[PDB]
Enzyme design. Sequence first.
Site, PDB file in Angstrom:
ATOM      1  N   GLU A   1      -9.424   3.959  -1.735  1.00 26.54           N
ATOM      2  CA  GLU A   1      -8.915   4.942  -2.700  1.00 26.54           C
ATOM      3  C   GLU A   1      -9.927   5.316  -3.755  1.00 26.54           C
ATOM      4  OE1 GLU A   1      -5.397   3.566  -4.728  1.00 26.54           O
ATOM      5  OE2 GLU A   1      -4.398   2.956  -2.835  1.00 26.54           O
TER       6      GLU A   1
ATOM      7  N   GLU B   1     -11.003   7.662  -0.574  1.00 19.35           N
ATOM      8  CA  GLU B   1     -10.199   8.175   0.538  1.00 19.35           C
ATOM      9  C   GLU B   1      -8.833   7.496   0.636  1.00 19.35           C
ATOM     10  OE1 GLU B   1      -9.701   5.266   2.805  1.00 19.35           O
ATOM     11  OE2 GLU B   1     -10.855   4.665   1.011  1.00 19.35           O
TER      12      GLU B   1
HETATM   13  O1  NIO Z   1     -13.725  -1.191   1.859  1.00 20.49           O
HETATM   14  C1  NIO Z   1     -12.811  -0.305   1.893  1.00 20.49           C
HETATM   15  O2  NIO Z   1     -12.927   0.749   1.213  1.00 20.49           O
HETATM   16  C2  NIO Z   1     -11.578  -0.506   2.761  1.00 20.49           C
HETATM   17  C3  NIO Z   1     -11.471  -1.698   3.568  1.00 20.49           C
HETATM   18  C4  NIO Z   1     -10.289  -1.772   4.329  1.00 20.49           C
HETATM   19  C5  NIO Z   1      -9.274  -0.850   4.380  1.00 20.49           C
HETATM   20  N1  NIO Z   1      -9.502   0.273   3.575  1.00 20.49           N
HETATM   21  C6  NIO Z   1     -10.596   0.474   2.784  1.00 20.49           C
HETATM   22  C1  PCR Z   2       0.057   0.216   2.281  1.00 20.30           C
HETATM   23  C2  PCR Z   2      -1.127   0.901   1.638  1.00 20.30           C
HETATM   24  C3  PCR Z   2      -2.244   1.259   2.402  1.00 20.30           C
HETATM   25  C4  PCR Z   2      -3.340   1.879   1.780  1.00 20.30           C
HETATM   26  C5  PCR Z   2      -3.321   2.154   0.404  1.00 20.30           C
HETATM   27  O1  PCR Z   2      -4.379   2.770  -0.211  1.00 20.30           O
HETATM   28  C6  PCR Z   2      -2.203   1.795  -0.347  1.00 20.30           C
HETATM   29  C7  PCR Z   2      -1.103   1.180   0.273  1.00 20.30           C
END
Ligand code: NIO
Ligand code: PCR
Lengths: 346, 346
Positions: free
Chosen positions: A314, A171
Amino acid sequence: LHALLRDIPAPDAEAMARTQQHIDGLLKPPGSLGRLETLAVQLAGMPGLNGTPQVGEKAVLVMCADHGVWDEGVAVSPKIVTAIQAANMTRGTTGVCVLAAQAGAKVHVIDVGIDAEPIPGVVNMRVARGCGNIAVGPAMSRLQAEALLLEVSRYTCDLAQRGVTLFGVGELGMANTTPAAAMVSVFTGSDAKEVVGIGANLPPSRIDNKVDVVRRAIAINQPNPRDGIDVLSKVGGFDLVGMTGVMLGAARCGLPVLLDGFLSYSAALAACQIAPAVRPYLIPSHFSAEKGARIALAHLSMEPYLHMAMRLGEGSGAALAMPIVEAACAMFHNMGELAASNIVLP
Amino acid sequence: LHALLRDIPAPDAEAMARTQQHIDGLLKPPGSLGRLETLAVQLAGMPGLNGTPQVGEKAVLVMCADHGVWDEGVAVSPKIVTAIQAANMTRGTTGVCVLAAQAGAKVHVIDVGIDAEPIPGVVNMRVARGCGNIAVGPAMSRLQAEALLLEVSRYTCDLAQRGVTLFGVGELGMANTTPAAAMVSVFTGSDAKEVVGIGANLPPSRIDNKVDVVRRAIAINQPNPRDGIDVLSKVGGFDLVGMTGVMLGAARCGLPVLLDGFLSYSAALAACQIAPAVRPYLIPSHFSAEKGARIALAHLSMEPYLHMAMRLGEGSGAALAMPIVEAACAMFHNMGELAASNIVLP
Ligand SMILES: O=C(O)c1cccnc1
Ligand SMILES: Cc1ccc(O)cc1
Ligand SMILES: O=C(O)c1cccnc1
Ligand SMILES: Cc1ccc(O)cc1
């Protein structure tokens, strides 16, 4: 959808038995390869895999969307980052992009509700321009959740038809750790304080507010824990919904899905609630550094393979574990046999 | 040898500082990639790497040897398996072989003391046909240990000259978990019962005897914990010595070495005792299922990346972690930058 759920296949015990016996006969002390053996058996049981642990093409599906809850001050990242990063995904400069390339996986960027104009190159499945602010009401309608589940599910199974045999889920959505914590709290019956983390570098001071926001979201919406779709629609998000949809789709297709981090655990709880039959298809990757990780994993009864203190999201953790999956297959197919070496053990 | 030890380079703090700043500027929340960032910085500090995290060629060195202690009934595997498996290593049908191929690494099989005729295709550095039975005396002479250290060290650094930039270390030797436990016990000051495991499927009943054997080995030899070479020579083995030699060699060469499992932890303790300067070059791979693993790792102050419940040895865990090393490099070199996206965080 009920059709979809009805048709998820059970794992093939026969294939698994054959797999186990084969593994036992390899050039090594029995059970010596531990989790790598268990993984191989797990894969063998997946109908879309053709009775054996194998990996064809790989894809990481990244669900992107904005959340109204951002307005509650729960995230330090500028709202626009979602849109920016989504575009970057098309350029291959992102973390998951770099890690997927390393694993030989393809990244699919899907916009399920980014609050910006459409991004060329990104798969368009936009529900709305960001979901509702869960703090004062539901994120979306049940209908909206159901339809997106359906749509993503289908897209997923469709990839299968093109050689994909291994999925990874991810995500992108500023403020998304807030709805994730809410879901976790609800599904596990844990108090908000216990599962609320710093997300993307939220200052220690700002935590209390984040906890209050989660509680408020729950109090106001009254999501029913025994109804995964109810929870998702009320206190989840489009991105969370989409991830659940990938899991539902892969299972129906009889294929494996690698989980990512915290956000993915939330989606997995929902998916398992909606359809327990989904469970056997899920494969953990890493152990997220988010505070609520341990609780969420315990409820999924999962023990990740990688301890990297990662918290990017991601689908980066998913990509990173792909080689492990391929290793179990390699082991299964390419090792020699005890008997061939006249090695006899007790 | 004292020369060798004298010349191990310190890590390059300047390169590390540059690395850190670069990492901080990548397209992600600062520190979000956790251990992957720390790994990259670690590599950057290694002089043989040329100021940046990079991976050229990879090699897994497997040290093979027999142990007199086998006669004490501490191992269920037939003694001959060492020789058999060593030959199999030349055929690429073994576990480490299969996993190395997957990682694109080359396996080097080295005979440091197998009790059998020489095996064609295997690097010959045989000390003797198996080491002394540690239960009633020393495994070998100090001279023998020193010379082997020297010899392996050199072989290691020599590979460097041929493009190898990443080493993995492994062994093969029936009964070898016995001397490993003895060393661990000695270096950590833990009681034998605490660190003695089942090795390759040793029956639960037979454990007591294994514990008694370790104690006896210690009582009889009186190895000096403050003298790594003393310990190795008395209660170690040729294979254990060779592994330590790889670590000494890679460090002198300013290059990284991936540890394997239990046996490798023992060798690492010895190496660190002999030369603390070695520490910064060591990289853990997995968390061995051997009982004494936790204690040994605690003393090395290491936290493995992989939790696979593996206990095969051969350097299989090392091979399995290689992709992680490459991931940290990929991350470092191929991700985009925050500034380029006009992304400003706090
Ligand atoms: O564990 C994750 O996937 C995560 C943790 C913090 C912020 N975004 C994603
Ligand atoms: C700043 C940022 C936040 C999330 C991400 O996946 C990448 C860059
Ligand atoms: O951890 C290991 O490397 C191991 C454990 C048991 C037997 N041989 C090797
Ligand atoms: C039986 C056996 C096989 C491989 C190995 O590395 C050890 C023991």
